[PDB]
Design a protein around this ligand. Structure first.
Ligand SMILES: *[C@@H]1O[C@H](CO)[C@@H](O[C@@H]2O[C@H](CO)[C@@H](O[C@@H]3O[C@H](CO[C@H]4OC[C@@H](O)[C@H](O[C@H]5O[C@H](CO)[C@@H](O)[C@H](O)[C@@H]5O)[C@@H]4O)[C@@H](O)[C@H](O[C@H]4OC[C@@H](O)[C@H](O)[C@@H]4O)[C@@H]3O)[C@H](O)[C@H]2NC(C)=O)[C@H](O)[C@H]1NC(C)=O
Ligand code: HEM
Ligand SMILES: *[C@@H]1O[C@H](CO)[C@@H](O[C@@H]2O[C@H](CO)[C@@H](O)[C@H](O)[C@H]2NC(C)=O)[C@H](O)[C@H]1NC(C)=O
Ligand SMILES: *[C@H]1O[C@H](CO)[C@@H](O)[C@H](O)[C@@H]1O[C@H]1OC[C@H](O)[C@H](O)[C@H]1O
Ligand SMILES: *[C@@H]1O[C@H](CO)[C@@H](O)[C@H](O)[C@H]1NC(C)=O
Ligand SMILES: *[C@H]1O[C@H](CO)[C@@H](O)[C@H](O)[C@@H]1O
Ligand SMILES: *[C@H]1O[C@H](CO)[C@@H](O)[C@H](O)[C@@H]1O
Ligand SMILES: *[C@H]1O[C@H](CO)[C@@H](O)[C@H](O)[C@@H]1O
Ligand SMILES: *[C@H]1O[C@H](CO)[C@@H](O)[C@H](O)[C@@H]1O
Ligand SMILES: *[C@H]1O[C@H](CO)[C@@H](O)[C@H](O)[C@@H]1O
Ligand SMILES: *[C@H]1O[C@H](CO)[C@@H](O)[C@H](O)[C@@H]1O
Ligand SMILES: *[C@H]1O[C@H](CO)[C@@H](O)[C@H](O)[C@@H]1O
Ligand SMILES: *[C@H]1O[C@H](CO)[C@@H](O)[C@H](O)[C@@H]1O
Ligand SMILES: *[C@H]1O[C@H](CO)[C@@H](O)[C@H](O)[C@@H]1O
Ligand SMILES: *[C@H]1OC[C@@H](O)[C@H](O)[C@@H]1O
Ligand SMILES: [Mn+2]
Length: 299
């Protein structure tokens, strides 16, 4: 939001306005990174970003502590070296390379299509980076009619996404990624769980309208009463939430589920790629931005 708008105080006293991304700007397959870039907390063009810039932006504008993104940082730079074919040091080339398939980016996402989803030819690939309304709807449909959802509901949503991806992806492509996706499930509970409820820390409930605003608009739901978590969220909350999701009892099992879908997942660890491995090509689609309606500087 613009200075003098009042939006943000007293949680974020140094806000910057929303600015839609241009056709030449680099965006990522991550709702959090795109929202930061849209507000200029990290380069608006999504290029040449350092670990320090990332750490401060998340902490000071999203209520996310450094511990939460420690592994994410390591993995972002592992992917950068893999894609560019060289050490990126302390400057992430751009946000787009984060969409390299079967790396940090994975199949069965909540709001993005898979790299080979519904393609007729084995050599084809599609946009697995930009927000996809239709895909997001398949996630929302699981909790239709509700204003909040818990760990059990989240477990159901991810199972529905794995089922659909397993059926729609070109034969041989689908690769399950429970460890990474569920850290992201933890990310959702950490950012948009209803802190107005007295037991928010023990049994967090995600507010659906907040989640929808963040994902669809790639900006913050201040208009809906949201504000960055305070105190800032720590990694402990995230992995605990991750484990709780996978541990929830399933009351509706979708068909065509990959083997081992229901059950605990392994701990997420640093990625590693062989120097001889050639990376898959990145989708070149221009960056997505909300158009129904378009957003103003304070949205
Ligand atoms: C964000 O950053 C990413 C990462 O940098 C950007 O994506 C990358 O963008 C570049 C363009 O800037 C794009 O490069 C082209 O790739 C063409 C296809 O290459 C593959 O297929 C053919 C193989 O022969 C080739 O391997 C051999 O050649 C390359 C160099 O071409 C060499 O490194 C290898 O070691 C092999 O010897 C490769 O596997 C390629 O044809 C094309 O080449 C031409 O460009 C100039 C010279 O290199 C050359 O003489 C040619 O004239 C060029 O390299 C990458 O493909 C792409 N990477 C991926 C993984 O998608 C992204 O664009 C950025 N986006 C934003 C919005 O900022
Ligand atoms: C700091 C470094 C971070 C990096 C490098 C990063 C990277 C990524 C990548 C590569 C994806 C795509 C994975 C996929 O295929 O779904 C992703 C997804 C996601 N990220 Fe981030 N991210 C970071 C931090 C965060 C944080 C802290 C939050 C929120 C509090 C967040 C929330 C999400 C969510 C919810 C998704 C899932 C989107 C979907 O499945 O549709 N990210 N991120
Ligand atoms: C995306 O953002 C826009 C702009 O803030 C949202 O539309 C407004 O939402 C508020 C409540 O947050 C309403 O009171 C306004 O009247 C809406 N304005 C318009 C022009 O529609 C929109 O709802 C957000 N999208 C999602 C999916 O949450
Ligand atoms: C790259 O290639 C060397 C041998 O040339 C392997 O030892 C590496 O582990 C790595 O191999 C992967 O990448 C290239 C091929 O696709 C190969 O199938 C793959 O296993
Ligand atoms: C914002 O300013 C008020 C006083 O003007 C202060 O109490 C509050 O803690 C500030 N918040 C932050 C995150 O700086
Ligand atoms: C989230 O975190 C828990 C605990 O580390 C894992 O079991 C889960 O697979 C996901 O990585
Ligand atoms: C979730 O799990 C992680 C390890 O995966 C712990 O470090 C954290 O304290 C929480 O229990
Ligand atoms: C780990 O932490 C989460 C979030 O605080 C709890 O919901 C869970 O019960 C576990 O104690
Ligand atoms: C991972 O962590 C959560 C925390 O409550 C447990 O519910 C789960 O059973 C696993 O131990
Ligand atoms: C059983 O309960 C879960 C949530 O606890 C639902 O998501 C499912 O649809 C069924 O009603
Ligand atoms: C649907 O079926 C699975 C096993 O196939 C159960 O784990 C689940 O509880 C639900 O009844
Ligand atoms: C119960 O609910 C799950 C998730 O919505 C479905 O995948 C299943 O087919 C049944 O409708
Ligand atoms: C790469 O290809 C996409 C579509 O496949 C274009 O929209 C983009 O501009 C670039 O040419
Ligand atoms: C996007 O564009 C529309 C129409 O120009 C405006 O209503 C909105 O404020 C945003 O600037
Ligand atoms: C709910 O609790 C977990 C599982 O036993 C399931 O079958 C029940 O419906
Ligand atoms: Mn994905």
């Amino acid at each position: 939001q613009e200075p003098g708008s009042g939006i943000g105080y007293p949680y974020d006293n140094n806000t910057l306005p929303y600015v839609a991304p241009g056709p030449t700007d680099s965006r990522a397959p991550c709702p959090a990174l795109n929202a930061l870039a849209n507000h200029g907390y990290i380069p608006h063009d999504g290029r040449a970003i350092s670990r320090e810039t990332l750490q401060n932006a998340f902490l000071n504008h999203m209520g996310i502590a450094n511990s939460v993104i420690e592994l994410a940082l390591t993995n972002a730079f592992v992917v950068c070296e893999y894609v560019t074919g060289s050490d990126c040091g302390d400057s992430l080339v751009n946000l787009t390379l984060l969409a390299e398939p079967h790396a940090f980016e994975h199949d069965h996402s909540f709001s993005r299509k898979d790299y080979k989803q519904g393609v007729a030819n084995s050599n084809d690939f599609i946009d697995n980076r930009n927000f996809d309304a239709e895909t997001f709807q398949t996630s929302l449909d699981v909790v239709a009619g509700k204003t909040h959802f818990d760990y059990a509901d989240m477990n159901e949503i991810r199972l529905q996404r794995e089922s659909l991806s397993n059926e729609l992806d070109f034969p041989g492509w689908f690769t399950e990624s429970k460890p990474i996706q569920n850290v992201e499930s933890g990310f959702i509970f950490a950012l948009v769980s209803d802190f107005n409820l007295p037991d928010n820390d023990e049994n967090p409930l995600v507010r659906i309208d907040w989640w929808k605003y963040w994902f669809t608009n790639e900006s913050f739901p201040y208009h809906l009463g949201w504000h960055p978590p305070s105190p800032a969220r720590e990694i402990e909350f995230v992995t605990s939430a991750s484990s709780a999701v996978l541990a929830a009892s399933v009351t509706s099992t979708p068909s065509s589920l990959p083997s081992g879908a229901i059950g605990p997942g392994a701990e997420a660890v640093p990625l590693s790629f062989a120097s001889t491995m050639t990376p898959f090509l990145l989708a070149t689609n221009a960056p997505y931005y909300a158009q129904d309606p378009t957003l103003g500087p304070n949205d």
